[PDB]
Amino acid sequence: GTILLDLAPEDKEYQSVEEEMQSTIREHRDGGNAGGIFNRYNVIRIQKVVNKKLRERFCHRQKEVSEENHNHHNERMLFHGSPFINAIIHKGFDERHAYIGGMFGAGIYFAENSSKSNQYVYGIGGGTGCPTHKDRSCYICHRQMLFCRVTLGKSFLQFSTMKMAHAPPGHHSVIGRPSVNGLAYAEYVIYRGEQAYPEYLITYQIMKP
Ligand SMILES: CC(C)(O)c1ccc(-c2nc3c(F)cc(F)cc3c(=O)[nH]2)cc1
Numbered sequence: 001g002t003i004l005l006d007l008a009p010e011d012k013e014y015q016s017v018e019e020e021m022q023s024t025i026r027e028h029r030d031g032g033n034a035g036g037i038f039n040r041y042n043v044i045r046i047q048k049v050v051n052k053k054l055r056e057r058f059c060h061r062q063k064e065v066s067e068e069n070h071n072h073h074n075e076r077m078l079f080h081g082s083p084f085i086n087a088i089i090h091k092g093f094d095e096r097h098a099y100i101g102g103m104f105g106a107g108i109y110f111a112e113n114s115s116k117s118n119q120y121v122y123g124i125g126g127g128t129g130c131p132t133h134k135d136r137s138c139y140i141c142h143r144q145m146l147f148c149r150v151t152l153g154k155s156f157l158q159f160s161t162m163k164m165a166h167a168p169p170g171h172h173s174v175i176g177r178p179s180v181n182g183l184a185y186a187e188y189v190i191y192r193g194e195q196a197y198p199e200y201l202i203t204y205q206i207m208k209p
Pocket residue numbers: 079080081082083084097098099100102109110111112116117118120123124186187188
Protein backbone atom coordinates (compact mmCIF):
# COMPACT_ATOMS: atom_id res chain seq x y z
CA GLY A 1 0.00 0.00 0.00
CA THR A 2 0.88 3.70 0.13
CA ILE A 3 4.01 4.71 2.03
CA LEU A 4 4.66 8.28 3.26
CA LEU A 5 8.28 9.51 3.21
CA ASP A 6 8.99 12.42 5.54
CA LEU A 7 10.86 15.33 3.93
CA ALA A 8 13.23 17.18 6.24
CA PRO A 9 12.78 21.01 6.49
CA GLU A 10 16.46 21.33 5.49
CA ASP A 11 15.74 19.53 2.14
CA LYS A 12 15.33 21.67 -1.05
CA GLU A 13 12.30 19.53 -2.03
CA TYR A 14 10.44 20.43 1.23
CA GLN A 15 11.45 24.09 0.73
CA SER A 16 10.13 24.24 -2.90
CA VAL A 17 6.74 22.79 -1.85
CA GLU A 18 6.41 25.14 1.13
CA GLU A 19 7.36 28.16 -1.01
CA GLU A 20 4.78 27.34 -3.66
CA MET A 21 2.15 26.87 -0.95
CA GLN A 22 2.94 30.13 0.84
CA SER A 23 3.53 32.34 -2.22
CA THR A 24 0.20 31.40 -3.83
CA ILE A 25 -2.02 32.50 -0.92
CA ARG A 26 -4.58 35.03 -1.99
CA GLU A 27 -7.44 37.00 -0.39
CA HIS A 28 -10.78 35.38 -1.16
CA ARG A 29 -14.16 36.92 -2.26
CA ASP A 30 -16.07 35.26 0.58
CA GLY A 31 -14.46 37.37 3.34
CA GLY A 32 -12.66 34.21 4.52
CA ASN A 33 -15.90 32.32 5.27
CA ALA A 34 -14.85 29.02 3.73
CA GLY A 35 -11.17 28.76 4.60
CA GLY A 36 -10.56 31.29 7.37
CA ILE A 37 -8.56 34.48 7.68
CA PHE A 38 -4.76 34.26 7.25
CA ASN A 39 -1.70 35.67 5.40
CA ARG A 40 0.53 32.61 6.09
CA TYR A 41 0.50 28.91 6.95
CA ASN A 42 2.49 27.20 9.69
CA VAL A 43 3.74 24.07 7.88
CA ILE A 44 3.91 21.08 10.27
CA ARG A 45 5.32 18.50 7.81
CA ILE A 46 5.55 17.59 4.15
CA GLN A 47 5.50 13.98 3.09
CA LYS A 48 6.14 12.40 -0.31
CA VAL A 49 3.44 9.81 -1.25
CA VAL A 50 4.80 6.57 -2.67
CA ASN A 51 2.55 3.99 -4.35
CA LYS A 52 3.97 2.08 -7.33
CA LYS A 53 0.52 0.86 -8.51
CA LEU A 54 -1.00 4.37 -8.42
CA ARG A 55 2.12 5.82 -10.05
CA GLU A 56 1.92 3.28 -12.89
CA ARG A 57 -1.73 4.13 -13.57
CA PHE A 58 -0.83 7.83 -13.69
CA CYS A 59 2.22 7.36 -15.93
CA HIS A 60 0.35 5.07 -18.30
CA ARG A 61 -2.34 7.69 -18.79
CA GLN A 62 0.22 10.51 -19.09
CA LYS A 63 1.95 8.71 -21.99
CA GLU A 64 -1.42 8.13 -23.66
CA VAL A 65 -2.37 11.82 -23.36
CA SER A 66 1.13 12.90 -24.58
CA GLU A 67 0.71 10.68 -27.72
CA GLU A 68 -2.80 12.18 -28.35
CA ASN A 69 -1.52 15.78 -27.87
CA HIS A 70 1.61 16.19 -30.09
CA ASN A 71 3.91 14.83 -27.29
CA HIS A 72 2.71 17.52 -24.79
CA HIS A 73 1.13 15.96 -21.72
CA ASN A 74 1.00 19.43 -20.08
CA GLU A 75 1.50 18.27 -16.51
CA ARG A 76 1.14 20.92 -13.82
CA MET A 77 1.71 20.91 -10.09
CA LEU A 78 -1.56 21.97 -8.44
CA PHE A 79 -3.24 21.92 -5.05
CA HIS A 80 -6.20 19.84 -3.90
CA GLY A 81 -8.17 20.10 -0.68
CA SER A 82 -10.76 17.52 0.29
CA PRO A 83 -12.38 16.19 3.47
CA PHE A 84 -11.62 12.72 2.03
CA ILE A 85 -7.88 13.22 1.56
CA ASN A 86 -7.13 9.98 3.45
CA ALA A 87 -8.90 7.98 0.71
CA ILE A 88 -6.96 9.79 -2.01
CA ILE A 89 -3.51 9.02 -0.61
CA HIS A 90 -4.39 5.35 -0.06
CA LYS A 91 -6.52 4.72 -3.17
CA GLY A 92 -5.56 7.55 -5.55
CA PHE A 93 -7.69 10.13 -7.32
CA ASP A 94 -11.06 8.76 -8.47
CA GLU A 95 -13.59 10.42 -10.82
CA ARG A 96 -16.22 8.20 -9.15
CA HIS A 97 -15.83 10.69 -6.23
CA ALA A 98 -16.06 13.81 -8.47
CA TYR A 99 -17.39 17.15 -7.18
CA ILE A 100 -20.85 16.95 -8.82
CA GLY A 101 -21.74 20.53 -7.94
CA GLY A 102 -18.55 22.07 -9.39
CA MET A 103 -18.84 24.86 -11.97
CA PHE A 104 -17.63 22.49 -14.73
CA GLY A 105 -19.71 19.51 -13.64
CA ALA A 106 -18.61 16.18 -12.27
CA GLY A 107 -14.82 16.41 -12.30
CA ILE A 108 -11.89 16.53 -9.87
CA TYR A 109 -10.90 20.14 -9.20
CA PHE A 110 -7.47 21.66 -8.50
CA ALA A 111 -6.18 25.14 -7.80
CA GLU A 112 -2.92 26.93 -8.60
CA ASN A 113 -3.54 28.99 -5.38
CA SER A 114 -3.09 26.99 -2.19
CA SER A 115 -5.65 29.17 -0.36
CA LYS A 116 -8.37 28.24 -2.86
CA SER A 117 -7.79 24.54 -2.07
CA ASN A 118 -7.78 25.44 1.68
CA GLN A 119 -11.50 26.44 1.20
CA TYR A 120 -12.27 22.72 0.58
CA VAL A 121 -10.30 20.95 3.33
CA TYR A 122 -13.39 20.75 5.54
CA GLY A 123 -15.83 20.34 2.64
CA ILE A 124 -17.68 22.42 0.07
CA GLY A 125 -17.74 26.04 1.26
CA GLY A 126 -15.57 24.92 4.23
CA GLY A 127 -18.51 22.81 5.51
CA THR A 128 -18.83 23.08 9.30
CA GLY A 129 -15.09 23.68 9.72
CA CYS A 130 -12.78 21.58 11.89
CA PRO A 131 -14.23 18.40 13.51
CA THR A 132 -13.21 19.44 17.07
CA HIS A 133 -14.32 23.11 17.20
CA LYS A 134 -16.69 23.42 14.18
CA ASP A 135 -14.63 26.48 13.16
CA ARG A 136 -13.82 27.16 9.49
CA SER A 137 -11.09 29.58 10.66
CA CYS A 138 -9.61 27.25 13.29
CA TYR A 139 -6.02 28.22 14.17
CA ILE A 140 -5.43 25.14 16.34
CA CYS A 141 -6.35 22.05 14.36
CA HIS A 142 -3.94 20.59 11.83
CA ARG A 143 -5.19 20.67 8.25
CA GLN A 144 -3.97 18.66 5.31
CA MET A 145 -3.86 19.38 1.59
CA LEU A 146 -2.25 17.77 -1.45
CA PHE A 147 0.21 19.23 -3.95
CA CYS A 148 -0.32 17.10 -7.02
CA ARG A 149 0.95 16.21 -10.45
CA VAL A 150 -1.97 16.81 -12.84
CA THR A 151 -2.01 15.69 -16.50
CA LEU A 152 -3.91 18.40 -18.36
CA GLY A 153 -3.21 17.44 -22.00
CA LYS A 154 -5.32 19.67 -24.28
CA SER A 155 -7.39 22.00 -22.04
CA PHE A 156 -10.72 23.55 -22.92
CA LEU A 157 -10.58 27.15 -21.62
CA GLN A 158 -13.72 28.72 -20.11
CA PHE A 159 -14.55 31.89 -18.18
CA SER A 160 -17.93 30.79 -16.74
CA THR A 161 -19.87 27.73 -15.68
CA MET A 162 -20.30 24.88 -18.21
CA LYS A 163 -21.41 21.66 -16.51
CA MET A 164 -20.28 18.43 -18.12
CA ALA A 165 -19.78 14.81 -17.09
CA HIS A 166 -16.57 14.20 -19.15
CA ALA A 167 -13.93 16.19 -20.89
CA PRO A 168 -15.03 18.00 -24.04
CA PRO A 169 -14.50 16.00 -27.28
CA GLY A 170 -10.83 16.14 -28.31
CA HIS A 171 -9.76 17.49 -24.90
CA HIS A 172 -8.33 16.16 -21.65
CA SER A 173 -9.24 18.82 -19.08
CA VAL A 174 -11.10 22.12 -18.55
CA ILE A 175 -9.59 25.30 -17.18
CA GLY A 176 -11.62 28.07 -15.57
CA ARG A 177 -9.59 31.21 -16.25
CA PRO A 178 -9.98 34.38 -14.10
CA SER A 179 -11.73 37.37 -15.72
CA VAL A 180 -13.06 40.78 -14.65
CA ASN A 181 -16.75 39.73 -14.11
CA GLY A 182 -15.79 36.09 -13.62
CA LEU A 183 -13.52 33.87 -11.56
CA ALA A 184 -11.19 35.39 -9.02
CA TYR A 185 -8.62 32.54 -9.36
CA ALA A 186 -8.09 29.72 -11.82
CA GLU A 187 -9.38 26.20 -11.45
CA TYR A 188 -8.37 23.06 -13.26
CA VAL A 189 -10.66 20.11 -13.84
CA ILE A 190 -10.03 16.54 -14.95
CA TYR A 191 -12.65 13.84 -15.46
CA ARG A 192 -10.43 10.76 -15.05
CA GLY A 193 -8.80 9.87 -11.73
CA GLU A 194 -5.63 8.59 -13.47
CA GLN A 195 -4.90 12.17 -14.65
CA ALA A 196 -3.70 13.17 -11.15
CA TYR A 197 -1.21 11.81 -8.59
CA PRO A 198 -1.15 12.97 -4.91
CA GLU A 199 2.62 13.75 -4.99
CA TYR A 200 2.90 15.52 -1.63
CA LEU A 201 0.85 15.53 1.54
CA ILE A 202 1.13 18.84 3.46
CA THR A 203 0.15 19.11 7.13
CA TYR A 204 -0.34 22.72 8.26
CA GLN A 205 -2.21 25.28 10.30
CA ILE A 206 -3.50 28.61 9.03
CA MET A 207 -1.90 31.49 11.03
CA LYS A 208 -3.89 34.23 12.73
CA PRO A 209 -2.87 37.69 11.33
C1 LIG B 1 -16.85 16.06 -3.54
C2 LIG B 1 -15.90 16.53 -2.43
C3 LIG B 1 -16.72 16.98 -1.21
O1 LIG B 1 -15.16 15.38 -2.00
C4 LIG B 1 -14.98 17.65 -2.90
C5 LIG B 1 -15.47 18.85 -3.40
C6 LIG B 1 -14.65 19.85 -3.90
C7 LIG B 1 -13.26 19.69 -3.79
C8 LIG B 1 -12.41 20.76 -4.31
N1 LIG B 1 -12.93 21.64 -5.13
C9 LIG B 1 -12.16 22.60 -5.66
C10 LIG B 1 -12.67 23.58 -6.51
F1 LIG B 1 -13.99 23.51 -6.80
C11 LIG B 1 -11.91 24.50 -7.16
C12 LIG B 1 -10.55 24.54 -6.85
F2 LIG B 1 -9.78 25.44 -7.48
C13 LIG B 1 -9.96 23.62 -5.99
C14 LIG B 1 -10.77 22.67 -5.36
C15 LIG B 1 -10.23 21.71 -4.40
O2 LIG B 1 -9.04 21.76 -4.03
N2 LIG B 1 -11.10 20.81 -3.91
C16 LIG B 1 -12.75 18.47 -3.31
C17 LIG B 1 -13.60 17.46 -2.85
